[PDB]
C-alpha cells in the first residue's frame, strides 16, 4: 500500500474544495483529507492538500506544497480568468518543486454547466503544450472526480 | 469561522489514526500559515 | 524496544511553530515505518 501526497490548486471558487470533498466524503452541497483507493488493481493511500485560491506567500506554505508529489491544476470551464491563471499555478509548482517535470493534471471543473466559456479543445490544447493530461470534472455530479485523482496518481508513477 | 485544529491523536493511536491526523494537520497548518 | 521513534504531539495548547515541527517529525516517522 503506497502513499501518495496530492495537492489541489487553482483560482478562487473553481471548486478545489468541492472536488476534494466529493473524492473523500462522496457528496456535494451548494474533515478528512485521506482516502484508500484501488487504482488499476493496486491499493493506494491518498492524502490531499486542499489549497487556497487567494495566494498569500509564506515560507511555511511553500514547505507544505513541496510535500506534494502530484498536483491537480483546476480551473472552472465557465471562468476564463481561472483558465488563464493556470500558467501562474504551473510555474509556482515548478518553482516550489525546483523541477521542470512535476506530475500534474489539468482539471476543467463545473462541466455540469451548459454555459461554458472555455471549450474542450482550448483546454486539451493547453494540456498538450504542457505534456500533461486534461480531465473534465463536475464536483456536482461526480463526473470525472475519481478519474482526475487516479490519473494524477498514474502521472506520478510515470516518474 | 476559522480552521479547525485537529485534536492530538493520542499516545496510543494506531498508524492509520496518525495518518488521518497527519493529513488534517497538513491542511490546518497550510490554512493558518501567516 | 524501539525502531523509528514516534514523536509526541506537542499538546492541545501547542504553538503553530511546535505543530510545524510535529508535522515534519510525524511525516518522517510514518515514512520510516513504511
Ligand atoms: N455547478 C457546480 N458548482 C460547483 C462545482 N464545484 C464547485 N462548485 C461551486 O463553486 C463554488 C466554489 O466551490 P469551492 O469548492 O469553494 O471552490 P474553491 O476552489 O475551494 N474556493 P477557494 O479558492 O475560495 O477555496 C461553490 O458554490 C461550489 O458549490 C461543480 O463542479 N459544479
Ligand atoms: Mg476551498
Residue numbers in the entry:
A (entry chain A): 1 to 30, 38 to 166
B (entry chain B): 0 to 33
C (entry chain C): -1 to 32
What text does the study give?
The Ras proteins are master regulators of cell proliferation and survival that transduce growth stimuli emanating from cell-surface receptors to cytoplasmic kinases responsible for orchestrating a comprehensive cell division program. Ras proteins are cytosolic, membrane-bound GTPases that bind guanine nucleotides and are regulated by their nucleotide state: guanosine triphosphate (GTP)–bound Ras adopts a conformation that binds Ras effector proteins with high affinity, leading to their activation and downstream signaling, whereas guanosine diphosphate (GDP)–bound Ras adopts a conformation that cannot bind effectors and thus is inactive. Here, we report our initial findings on an alternative approach, one that exploits directed evolution to discover miniproteins having extraordinarily high affinity for the most functionally relevant surface of Ras, the effector domain. High-resolution crystal structures demonstrate that the miniproteins bind Ras as a dimer and interact via a distinct binding mode that captures the Ras effector domain in an open conformational state, which can be stabilized by insertion of a proline at Asp-38 in Ras.
In light of the homodimeric nature of the miniproteins, we reasoned that the miniprotein residues must have been constrained by symmetry during the directed evolution such that the most favored amino acid at each position was the best compromise between the two sites within the dimer. As KRas is an asymmetric target that forms markedly different interactions with the two miniprotein protomers, we hypothesized that breaking the symmetry and permitting each protomer to evolve independently might afford improvements in binding. To test this, we used a dual-display YSD system in which two miniproteins based on 225-11 A30R (primary protomer a and secondary protomer b) were codisplayed on the yeast surface, inspired by prior work by Boder and co-worker. After randomizing selected residues in both miniproteins, screening for binding at low-nanomolar concentrations of KRas-GppNHp, and merging consensus mutations, we identified a heterodimeric miniprotein, 225-15a/b, with 13 mutations overall across both protomers relative to the 225-11 A30R parent. The 225-15a/a homodimer bound KRas-GppNHp with ∼3-fold reduced affinity compared with 225-11 A30R, and the 225-15b/b homodimer had no detectable binding. However, the 225-15a/b heterodimer bound KRas-GppNHp ∼10-fold more strongly than 225-11 A30R with an affinity of 60 ± 20 pm, which to our knowledge is more than an order of magnitude stronger than all known Ras effector proteins or synthetic ligands. 225-15a/b binds with subnanomolar affinity to all three Ras isoforms (KRas, NRas, and HRas) and to both wildtype KRas as well as the oncogenic mutants G12V, G13D, and Q61H. 225-15a/b also preserves selectivity for Ras over other GTPases with relatively weak (>100 nm) affinity for Rap1a, RalA, and Rab25.
